[PDB]
Amino acid sequence: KVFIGRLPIMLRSKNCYLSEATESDLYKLKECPFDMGGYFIINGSEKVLIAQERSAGNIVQVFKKAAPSPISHVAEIRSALE
């Protein structure tokens, strides 16, 4: 019912024409059959989003403190609303 912005699409993904396309379909589209998609195409250039690694959340872990420290050990839990 209402339009709110444009969502850049990832090639070879469901919402991308190339998904269902095949061999001949592609050549006729000019896209290379061997392409593997997985990237975006913002303002002309092919953009790749790089996986960002990090520590899983909501988990309990204990670590010992340094010799100089009023604290001996500690139990940490990083709580995040999934």
Q: Which of 41, 48, 37 is nearest to 6 (CA)?
A: 41
Region 19-58 residues binding other proteins, contact defined as CB under 8 A: 27-28, 30, 33
Give yes or no for residue 17 binding other proteins (CB under 8 A): no
Alpha helices in 1-82, H assignment, sequence order: 23-27
10/31 with CB nearer other proteins: 31
Q: How far is the CB of 27 from other proteins (least distance, A)?
A: 5
Give the Cα separation of 50 and 6 in Å (integer): 21
| Interaction site with other proteins (CB under 8 A) | 27-28, 30, 33
